[PDB]
Amino acid sequence: YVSCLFRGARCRVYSGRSCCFGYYCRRDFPGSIFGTCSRRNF
Question: Residue 32 contacts by C-beta under 8 Å, 6 or more apart in sequence?
Fold first, then answer.
Protein backbone atom coordinates (compact mmCIF):
# COMPACT_ATOMS: atom_id res chain seq x y z
CA TYR A 1 0.00 0.00 0.00
CA VAL A 2 2.66 2.49 1.07
CA SER A 3 5.84 0.44 1.50
CA CYS A 4 7.83 -1.03 -1.39
CA LEU A 5 10.03 -4.03 -2.17
CA PHE A 6 13.75 -3.71 -1.46
CA ARG A 7 16.77 -5.41 -3.03
CA GLY A 8 16.95 -9.11 -2.25
CA ALA A 9 13.20 -9.43 -1.71
CA ARG A 10 10.61 -11.83 -3.12
CA CYS A 11 8.18 -10.46 -5.70
CA ARG A 12 5.77 -12.24 -8.04
CA VAL A 13 4.27 -11.10 -11.34
CA TYR A 14 0.81 -10.66 -9.81
CA SER A 15 2.29 -9.16 -6.64
CA GLY A 16 1.24 -5.84 -5.14
CA ARG A 17 3.02 -2.57 -5.92
CA SER A 18 6.29 -2.44 -7.86
CA CYS A 19 9.75 -2.35 -6.28
CA CYS A 20 11.15 0.69 -4.47
CA PHE A 21 12.50 3.72 -6.32
CA GLY A 22 15.22 2.57 -8.69
CA TYR A 23 14.29 -1.10 -8.39
CA TYR A 24 12.26 -3.61 -10.40
CA CYS A 25 11.09 -7.23 -10.27
CA ARG A 26 12.39 -9.95 -12.60
CA ARG A 27 10.96 -13.40 -13.30
CA ASP A 28 12.87 -16.57 -12.41
CA PHE A 29 12.80 -18.22 -15.83
CA PRO A 30 10.80 -18.31 -19.12
CA GLY A 31 7.47 -19.45 -17.70
CA SER A 32 7.69 -18.53 -14.02
CA ILE A 33 5.16 -16.88 -11.71
CA PHE A 34 7.44 -15.65 -8.92
CA GLY A 35 10.74 -13.79 -9.07
CA THR A 36 13.06 -11.42 -7.23
CA CYS A 37 13.67 -7.67 -6.96
CA SER A 38 16.81 -6.30 -8.61
CA ARG A 39 18.22 -2.80 -9.14
CA ARG A 40 17.22 -1.36 -12.51
CA ASN A 41 20.74 -0.14 -13.25
CA PHE A 42 20.98 0.22 -17.03
Answer: none
